[PDB]
Amino acid sequence: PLGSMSQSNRELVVDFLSYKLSQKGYSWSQMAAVKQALREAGDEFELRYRRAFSDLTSQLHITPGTAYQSFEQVVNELFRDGVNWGRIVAFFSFGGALCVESVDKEMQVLVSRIAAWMATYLNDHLEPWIQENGGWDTFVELYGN
Amino acid sequence: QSNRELVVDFLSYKLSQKGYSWSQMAAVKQALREAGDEFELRYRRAFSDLTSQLHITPGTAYQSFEQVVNELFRDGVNWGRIVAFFSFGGALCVESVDKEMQVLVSRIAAWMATYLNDHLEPWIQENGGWDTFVELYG
Numbered sequence: 001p002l003g004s005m006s007q008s009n010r011e012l013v014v015d016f017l018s019y020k021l022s023q024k025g026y027s028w029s030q031m032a033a034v035k036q037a038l039r040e041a042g043d044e045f046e047l048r049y050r051r052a053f054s055d056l057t058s059q060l061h062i063t064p065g066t067a068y069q070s071f072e073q074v075v076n077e078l079f080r081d082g083v084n085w086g087r088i089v090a091f092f093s094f095g096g097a098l099c100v101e102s103v104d105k106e107m108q109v110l111v112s113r114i115a116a117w118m119a120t121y122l123n124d125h126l127e128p129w130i131q132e133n134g135g136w137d138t139f140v141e142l143y144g145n
Numbered sequence: 146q147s148n149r150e151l152v153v154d155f156l157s158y159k160l161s162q163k164g165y166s167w168s169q170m171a172a173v174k175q176a177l178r179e180a181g182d183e184f185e186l187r188y189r190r191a192f193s194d195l196t197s198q199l200h201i202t203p204g205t206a207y208q209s210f211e212q213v214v215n216e217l218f219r220d221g222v223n224w225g226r227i228v229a230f231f232s233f234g235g236a237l238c239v240e241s242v243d244k245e246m247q248v249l250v251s252r253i254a255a256w257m258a259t260y261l262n263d264h265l266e267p268w269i270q271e272n273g274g275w276d277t278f279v280e281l282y283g
């Protein structure tokens with residue numbers, strides 16, 4: 001691809017500057033602040049619930065044949081008693097754990113599939129609640145206090 | 146706004162924590178961030194002396210940034226100086242936000258891509274590319 005070098009150089013500059021801004025409580029953009037808050041929230045959730053969380057992640061047996069329906073059914077477990085930001089963070093951590101597992105088990109085909117499942121689940125089931133509850137900007141405020 | 150952007154960012158981060166690369170640059174990015182932290186902490190005096198060379202205003206253009214950065218590479222190019230160059234750009238961006246000039250962040254990012262492309266990329270490619278930096282500083 002003719003743009004690879006340009007994309008690589010831009011990705012490197014922006015990654016470095018976003019990191020340095022974030023260390024000072026600033027942001028490259030509002031999206032960069034949401035991303036960073038979600039990275040940290042996912043790390044915090046995973047550190048506090050690791051072993052208990054494997055009771056949820058272990059509910060989905062991933063193969064090259066796994067479709068959206070099976071992912072949706074397991075994720076619906078997080079939202080049976082309703083939606084909140086904590087449950088939303090765990091949903092991202094769930095997707096993250098499946099993605100890592102897919103790569104570990106040489107099923108790299110599932111990375112794209114999992115990313116697509118997450119966007120569909122968010123747009124079909126969580127986006128109406130997110131918008132009614134102040135959007136991602138509110139998540140950043142609440143998480144950061 | 147974009148849930149796709151948040152999904153990819155989160156998955157790329159979780160992959161990177163396990164030494165897996167969503168993009169080609171993941172190992173390079175990780176090594177550079179950490180080398181930047183190490184330079185700023187271990188050689189904070191050089192870092193502070195470098196940062197103070199450029200007085201940024203709403204009127205600062207590429208030419209002033211390039212003049213200071215040229216002095217950094219006066220004795221030639223090496224990986225340590227490249228690290229300092231990224232730390233220098235980072236420090237100018239933080240200072241711009243401190244002084245209520247967040248707009249200058251995009252200007253600095255554009256200066257850095259131009260300087261890298263025009264002055265540093267030929268040396269980087271002749272010296273084993275960014276993969277060689279990863280082996281040396283990561």
Ligand SMILES: Cc1ccc(CN(C(=O)N[C@@H](CSCc2ccccc2)C(=O)O)C(=O)c2ccc(-c3ccccc3)cc2)cc1
Pocket residue numbers: 040041042044045048049052053054055056078084085086087089090139142143
């Ligand atoms: C960063 C972080 C995220 C989530 C949590 C945990 N948290 C939880 O404080 N809730 C709160 C919901 S609001 C929490 C919040 C507000 C704003 C931003 C981020 C988090 C509650 O029930 O009151 C959950 O909602 C939660 C979600 C899933 C599990 C779980 C599911 C399956 C198996 C094992 C564990 C266990 C707990 C802790 C820390």
Ligand SMILES: Cc1ccc(CN(C(=O)N[C@@H](CSCc2ccccc2)C(=O)O)C(=O)c2ccc(-c3ccccc3)cc2)cc1
Pocket residue numbers: 184188191192194195198213216217220224225226228229
């Ligand atoms: C206009 C201006 C330019 C430069 C400076 C400060 N200044 C710097 O005098 N540089 C010189 C001398 S410091 C060399 C050195 C330091 C530590 C270990 C080994 C060598 C250089 O890069 O030649 C650096 O910015 C600098 C750059 C890179 C490093 C470094 C980076 C990574 C690892 C080790 C050293 C260390 C220092 C201030 C103002």
